[PDB]
Amino acid sequence: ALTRLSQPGLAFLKCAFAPPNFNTDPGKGIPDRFEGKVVSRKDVLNQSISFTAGQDTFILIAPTPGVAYWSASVPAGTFPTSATTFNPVNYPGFTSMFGTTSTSRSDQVSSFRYASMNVGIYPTSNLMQFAGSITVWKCPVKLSTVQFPVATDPATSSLVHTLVGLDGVLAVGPDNFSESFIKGVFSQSACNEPDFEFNDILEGIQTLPPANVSLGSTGQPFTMDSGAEATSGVVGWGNMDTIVIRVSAPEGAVNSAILKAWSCIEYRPNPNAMLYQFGHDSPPLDEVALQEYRTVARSLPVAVIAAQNASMWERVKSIIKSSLAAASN
Amino acid sequence: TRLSQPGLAFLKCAFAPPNFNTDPGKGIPDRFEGKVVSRKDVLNQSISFTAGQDTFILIAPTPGVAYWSASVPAGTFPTSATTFNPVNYPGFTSMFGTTSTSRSDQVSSFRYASMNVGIYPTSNLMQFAGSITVWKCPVKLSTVQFPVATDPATSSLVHTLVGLDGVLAVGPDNFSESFIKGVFSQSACNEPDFEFNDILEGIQTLPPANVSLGSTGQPFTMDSGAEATSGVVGWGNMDTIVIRVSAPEGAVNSAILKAWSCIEYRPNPNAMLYQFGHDSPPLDEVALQEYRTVARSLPVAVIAAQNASMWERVKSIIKSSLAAASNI
Amino acid sequence: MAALTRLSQPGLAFLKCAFAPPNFNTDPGKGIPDRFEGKVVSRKDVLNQSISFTAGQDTFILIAPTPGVAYWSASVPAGTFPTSATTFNPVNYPGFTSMFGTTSTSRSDQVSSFRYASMNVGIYPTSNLMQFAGSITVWKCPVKLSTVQFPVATDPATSSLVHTLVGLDGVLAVGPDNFSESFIKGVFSQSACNEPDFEFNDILEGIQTLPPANVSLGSTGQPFTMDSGAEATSGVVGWGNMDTIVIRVSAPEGAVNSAILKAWSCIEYRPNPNAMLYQFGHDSPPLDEVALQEYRTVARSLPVAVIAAQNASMWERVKSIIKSSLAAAS
Amino acid sequence: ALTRLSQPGLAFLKCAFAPPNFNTDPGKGIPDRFEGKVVSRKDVLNQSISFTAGQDTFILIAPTPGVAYWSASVPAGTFPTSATTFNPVNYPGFTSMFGTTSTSRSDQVSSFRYASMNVGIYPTSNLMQFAGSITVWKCPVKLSTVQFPVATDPATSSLVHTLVGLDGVLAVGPDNFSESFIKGVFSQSACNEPDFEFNDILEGIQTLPPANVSLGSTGQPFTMDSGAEATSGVVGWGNMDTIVIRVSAPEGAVNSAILKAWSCIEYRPNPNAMLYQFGHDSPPLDEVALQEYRTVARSLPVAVIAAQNASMWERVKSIIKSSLAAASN
Amino acid sequence: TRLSQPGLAFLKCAFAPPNFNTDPGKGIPDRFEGKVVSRKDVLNQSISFTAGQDTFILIAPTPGVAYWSASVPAGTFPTS
Amino acid sequence: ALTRLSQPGLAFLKCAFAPPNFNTDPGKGIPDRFEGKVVSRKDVLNQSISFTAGQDTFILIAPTPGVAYWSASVPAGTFPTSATTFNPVNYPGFTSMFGTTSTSRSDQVSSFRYASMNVGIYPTSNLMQFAGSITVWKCPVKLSTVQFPVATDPATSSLVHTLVGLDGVLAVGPDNFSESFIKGVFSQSACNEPDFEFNDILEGIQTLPPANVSLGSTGQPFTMDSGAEATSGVVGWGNMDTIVIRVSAPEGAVNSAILKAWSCIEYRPNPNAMLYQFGHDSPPLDEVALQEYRTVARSLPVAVIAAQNASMWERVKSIIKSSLAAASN
RNA sequence: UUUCUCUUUUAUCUU
RNA sequence: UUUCUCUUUUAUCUU
RNA sequence: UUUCUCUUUUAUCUU
RNA sequence: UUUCUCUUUUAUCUU
Ligand SMILES: [Ca+2]
Ligand SMILES: [Ca+2]
Ligand SMILES: [Ca+2]
Ligand SMILES: [Ca+2]
Ligand SMILES: [Ca+2]
Ligand SMILES: [Ca+2]
Ligand SMILES: [Cl-]
Secondary structure (H helix, E strand, O other): OOOOHHHHHHHHHHHHOOOOOOOOOOOOOOOOOOOOEEEEEEEEEEEEEEEEEOOOEEEEOOOOOOOEEEEEEEEEEOOOOOOOEEEEEEEEOHHHHHOOOOOOOHHHHEEEEEEEEEEEEEEOOOOOOOEEEEEEEEOEEEEEEEEEEEEEOEEEEEEEEEEHHHHHHHHOOOEEOOOOOOOOOOEEEEEEEOOOOEEEEEEEOEEEOOOOHHHHHHHHOEEEOOOOOOOOOOOOOOOOOOEEEEEEEEEOEEEEEEEEEEOOOOOOOOOOOHHHHHEEEOOOOOHHHHHHHHHHHHHHEEEEEHHHOOOOHOOOOOOHHHHHHHHOO | OOOOOOHHHHHHHOOOOOOOOOOOOOOOOOOOOOOEEEEEEEEEEEEEOOOOOEEEEEEEOOOOOEEEEEEEEEEOOOOOOEEEEEEOOOOOOHHOOOOOOOOOOOOOEEEEEEEEEEEEEEOOOOOOOEEEEEEEOOEEEEEEEEEOOOOOEEEEEEEEEOOHHHHHOOOOOEEEEHHOEEEEEEEEEOOOOOOOOOOOOOOEEEEOOOOOOOHOOOOEEEEOOOOOOOOOOOOOOOOEEEEEEEEEEOOOEEEEEEEEEEEEEEEOOOOOOOHHHHHOOOOOOOHHHHHHHHHHHOOOOEEEHHHHHHHHHHHHHHHHHHHHHHHO | HHHHOOOOOHHHHHHHHHHHOOOOOOOOOEEEEEOOOOOEEEEEEEEEEEEEEEOOOOEEEEEEEOOOEEEEEEEEOOOOOOOOOEEEEEEEEHHHHHHHOOOOOOOOEEEEEEEEEEEEEEEEOOOOOOOOOOOOEEEEEEEEEEEEEEEEOOOOEEEEEEEEOOOOOHHOOOOOOEEEEEHOOOEEEEOOOOOOOOOOEOOOOOOOOEOOOOOOOOOHHHOOOOOOOOOOOOOOOOOOOOEEEEEEEOOOOOOOEEEEEEEEEEEEEEOOOOOOOOOHHOOOOOOOHHHHHHHHHHHHHHOOOEEEEHHHHHHHHOOOOHHHHOOOOO | OOOOOHHHHHHHHHHHOOOOOOOOOOOOOOOOOOOOEEEEEEEEEEEEEEEEEOOOEEEEEEOOOEEEEEEEEEEEOOOOOOOEEEEEEEOOOHHHOOOOOOOOHHHHHEEEEEEEEEEEEOOOOOOOOOOOOEEEEEEEOOOEEEEEOOOOOOOOEEEEEEEOOHHHHHOOOOOEEEHHHHHOOOEEEOOOOOOOOOEEOOOOOOOEEEOOOOOHHOOOOOEEEOOOOOOOOOOOOOOOOEEEEEEEOOOOOOOEEEEEEEEEEEEOOOOOHHHHOEEOOOOOOOOOHHHHHHHHHOOOOOOOOOHHHOOOOHHHHHHHHHHHOOOOO | OOHHHHHHHHHHHHHOOOOOOOOOOOOOOOOOOOOOOOOOOOOOOOOOOOOOEEEEEEEEEOOOOOOEEEEEOOOOOOOO | OOOOOOOHHHHHHHHHHOOOOOOOOOOOOOOOOOOOOEEEEEEEEEEEEEEEOOEEEEEOOOOOOOOOEEEEEEEEEOOOOOEEEEEOOOOOOOOHOOOOOOOOHHHHHEEEEEEEEEEEEEEEOOOOOOOOOEEEEEOOOEEEEEEEEEEOOOOEEEEEEEOOHHHHOOOOOOEEEEEEEEHOOOEEEOOOOOOOOOEEOOOOOEEOOOOOOHHHHHHOOOOOEOOOOOOOOOOOOOOEEEEEEEEEEEOOEEEEEEEEEEEEEEEEEEOOOOOOHOOEEEOOOOOHHHHHHHHHHOOOEEEHHHHHHOOOHHHHHHHHHHHEEEEEE
16 A cells, blocks of 8 residues: 555655654655755754753744754743743854854855654653643644834835744643653644645844834744854744743753754755765655645644653554545455 | 635635525635634615716725725726725724734734625616726736935935826726616625735825825835824735726715625734634645636626525535546 | 657647747746636747857856846956956846836836746857857756845844845856766757746845845845846746756857857736737646646756757657656556 | 549658759649639759858848748848848759849749749868868748838829848847758748749849938848849749858858759740740648648748758658648547 | 647637636747737727717728727718 | 676776766775765866966865866976965865864764775867867875974974875876877876875865965975965875976967766765765775776876867776686686 | 666665 | 550659 | 565666 | 559650
């Protein structure tokens, strides 16, 4: 049954829903209509992380290139406020691709498009000290713009990047996974568009709201700060929903874990880049894989405990064969 | 092959005439199948047209706002001296707040499936006079880049509507008929696919505050008013319908106007909207090609009487096109 | 053949305007065989220009998907590439103004949005065998039109956002995937949609230079500058979804390099009801699965560029790649 | 496959797109509905020609009977102006058919209709001295009329022959062939009507605008002067587009060549003419040939280099068999 | 046999009623296949007819001119 | 016969002596004892170049990572003098690997080792204007050090990088290839050590002699200037002899060409680099390939004309089979 | 671009 | 205008 | 790490 | 200029 899929079409589905803990081929690309030259980037992060007691730590798997996630900590039982600021954590070699200045992101590559975005939280802590829960839901966060006037001389109108849908982080979504901390968790996001459009690399973005822009004007409920332009930054915004994770650590609880992040991204490389050497045409269209991708995604749970992560690939193959069969009637 | 339930519903909300208890359907049978909330916006507006005036109505793919209306002296078109004002769909505020920075509080993005409009004359036959003329415009929301002599010197970039110049003349492809005969017309996706558009914050006027209409290139103005009552939350990929009601001097032109919109929004987990969301309908190749074929085959607009047999006209175009394909 | 019979009439025309020389193809073709079937106006822009290259200078040309401008050129010192000090200047296709007016704010008067189908270019040397010298190198860059965000110390202090050309840097190095041959052998090369689908792009208002007026090249990241000149003669009306063809013509000193330059552009526009253009419109041709798949395949199968001599073999060369892949399916 | 064509139907297609350098049968006529008596005239010119340096020489293959082409020279980088005058070059024996006075053209024949109109430019010059290019495009030039008043006594209204579509010569058509001079060129024109209508022979035409007629009144962008009525003249205007050729010779360039012109024309002969002796009925209708003619014509390039001229006939047969085959489905 | 795309479009521009987003079609499906430009001319004219007058309108095959209008006293026809 | 070589062992020999004009696999690595993780970098340059008349232009294919070659021009009939300075030309994406400051070269990679170094010069110029010759020889240039005292306070002793064997560029080596310019040339260099040792990446090197160092102290006959630290630099010195090319262009000669450069390099990647994603173990030892490598190298000519470049691979296979056969006795 | 064998040599899919 | 053979004798189409 | 088939799917070597 | 078939397609010579 899984023989109706082209080689890449299958590979594609594995990067998408499978956890390549093994050094599996990073990617073969996306089996969609596009077949121009791209570079399959397999971003993976392994961050050991300790959650502070009495704090409800928030993590955002936000489809920003090179930066695995963003996290902020808030007093237990509460959510981010205007007073909150999220700080990015990068994937290995951020600078090796986007440079060290807010105006050199498009040096290596010009555009991109995500294929997968997975995350897992495995628990370090012993069974006597842990406590608390891990809650997950996904937000349709897009990167729009805000228009407002400014009393300068002459008076003028401003336009800047603003994040819409952030207000979704201020409450636990109805469609969510919630369970004991110790059980860990695995979850992934998918393309929030009817197709895989290429997005441009964005220059100069270090903070949202921008420098000199008040938060109130933006609409955004809180702030995104990538920090020094030489260490991190916002190079773009993919068409993937953002995964939200709330790890609430009660008082005196010793909750530690290891967090892993996966990201299959097709970048359009520049000839002057060395990166270009590893370019290859995108895999040619695989109608079946593209239809299964959608079906599988819609079928899977918001998230699952860490243990069920291994059977994840197996869980996926059954949904496919079950879909390919129920469609042979 | 045949259409799915959602794929058929999709075609009904799309071309279905008003009255049919049309089902919003599960939404768009297009490759996307993520979480969405289907809203079927409907407006019923009693309205009287100023005699000796040529009133211009615009159905444009802005969420929450049915149409935009401006009026000018009979025989003329909008001028730089003209400003169009929104009329809201019921509950605009309950969706996009009361601040120009509250639009994306409930939903983050959207995509139009249909955008219909109908005008049913209520005038008694002698009293009424005039015509109704319709044509559609490919109005897109772009941007304009101009420098500004501030200190230090800077360059501005702001929203600007392109293709508005098409409203200053009656498009060759148009429907023209006696006012009394009413009218029904619909718009459709002006893109090959139904991609999602983002919700836009801060937009109240175009040209925006502190920008001269000269800077934008726009032929006239768009004013939504108090940010507490209305505003421009986004611009969808649908051609904009233009309606000219020509009321001569001493003409009593009264009528009802209905606005239909089928929109798929991406709900924010925090919104009270979310509990009504489901997943966008899985791809229905048939529907997606029927949609396109029907759209192209349908007239710009029709009189109100032909609207009733409109659905039947659609099933007619469905079988004829489907029959040729089945034969091979 | 069975392949040729499967293709819808517009679908065939589409492929020709895309991969084949204009002289071979009288037709533009109706338009793009994709799902979109709304009202459009197919224009096939063709520039013919006798050009002579500056001896002792490398001239760089860019076939960049901006409507109604054929290409952008600039010459630099032999052996070097564009620098911050360099500025590229457009050459228009015939009747630029008749399409996009004469002021930087009247670009969207005739049409509102657009989408490219094909974008070819060819150089036919006209020098005798006692005067020609030098090389013609060609590669393509994925140049997209994005934006840059940066704060400004005005009163009050504000944050700017302007247009920036991303991936322009690729023009400063000849990528491993390239065509390079003696000048005399001329060259032919086309570009194709760098997106999975042909979506429409808006017409851009007020753009005359990039970086724009009052902006330092430094704050944009762009390696060099783009200047369309007087708003009354040219300008940047938009940026299509096609990779940009880069061309480096090196002329040694004392060399007479003359040639003819041709440029094709199959573009589908969204006509404004008021435009005098509109009366020539028609509906975009309906979807042709086959043609769209052949397009992709052929596109990826063709070489970066080819010498002018085997350019005629091109149409026939393509007809081969179509029947070779349409062989695997059945 | 090429056996579905009648003998003449094939012949017809050869005269049309083939270069009978060989003394091939001149013609068998046109396989259209008409079958009355005609005379198949195979006009052929062999003119050695040297292009002056710094001049962009313009040649017009204009479907005027007996006159191969018309040429004028303009300063390089420029086009004909109101100040330009084109002078005809005749095909052998012009006078032997149209006489020696502007009012004796219809003496031999009364009407006509073109079948083919081909032209080729082969290059004399060595590879060290040549330079420049040959550009080609075709213009829909028809022969209409202009109506204007004249202040005579009594005042009256004039009506005279005027050429419409000449403005097409003032710019290089978008559909054109352009290439290095040395590569030569071959191109042909075809019937610009849905059928082969007969045109009358025109008496008294020596210049356009006529004698006593100002150029401005005509609309014509430049002038056509056939010269002495005893040596040349305009005897008619066929339903063929006119082939335009711009040979631009840079400064110091030594560009010479040999130009050849072909023209298959069916003339209606007069009994009192000796010419009549060689009359024969037009070939009876050959639906296939008439449909192929159209297909082939539409398929062929504007023009091709001289070298590809030999394979021209072969190029044509493949288009036919390819059309006859793709139509057997 | 059945009609071609252009041949069908041809029949639509020919008899198609106004409103149908009629496609100019590629033009005339007639033996000729040379270069042409298809133009679909459309005029929308608001007009009032003089009372006691018999207004005469002429649609005539002149490019660029929709119609020709003259008016005469009711019950009569054009005169020199 | 060529089946006694492992897959990589063969590949290895192709990168070494074959011109992958085709996008052949860049590399599989070096079949030597080492099997740790490396990244096979296939550096390739395509530089159009015009040689000035009356000048004897000198090009050095010097096994410095990221920089294809270095060239200087001297008055015809002469060689570099103390007054000469060579300027590097980079391979695409220099900065994308070694950064933009003289102290960030070891950011991406830590060490390296060359496998191949090939160069070819193909001629643009016509046969009437060219003149002159291309001369080639190879120099055993190593990167050593110089020790000298400096009268500072307190007085101290300096030690800096100095290039030994540069004096080999001041005369045409006895073992050389010399031939008419128009004939072009192809030549390659090989490992100048009994094994493939890894060399470290060198920080801070922009010029040799260094800044503040007089040329006389160094011993070096001329100067090496990589220019702005943000555009180029000397990141290391491989164990390959340097290829020297002297293109002497007489007065009035119009000599142009296209120069190509190949370089197979195994770099030891850093985990924090994205570059690392494309790492793989070095191919395991292939005694045969390593012995053939040596034999082939020793056999081949200094250089050959451009035309014989295509048969180069074939020329190589025959030497191998001829060696594998003459060794079966 | 015309053609197969052979070993390759990876890479999945299945027991 | 009623009919074939025969050589003609050109003329293409195909290997 | 225990085992084969199968199609893969690239990749060379040979005619 | 190297070679035949095939239909041609005219054109005579003969019943
Ligand atoms: Ca908000
Ligand atoms: Ca899209
Ligand atoms: Ca405008
Ligand atoms: Ca940059
Ligand atoms: Ca005129
Ligand atoms: Ca020394
Ligand atoms: Cl020109």
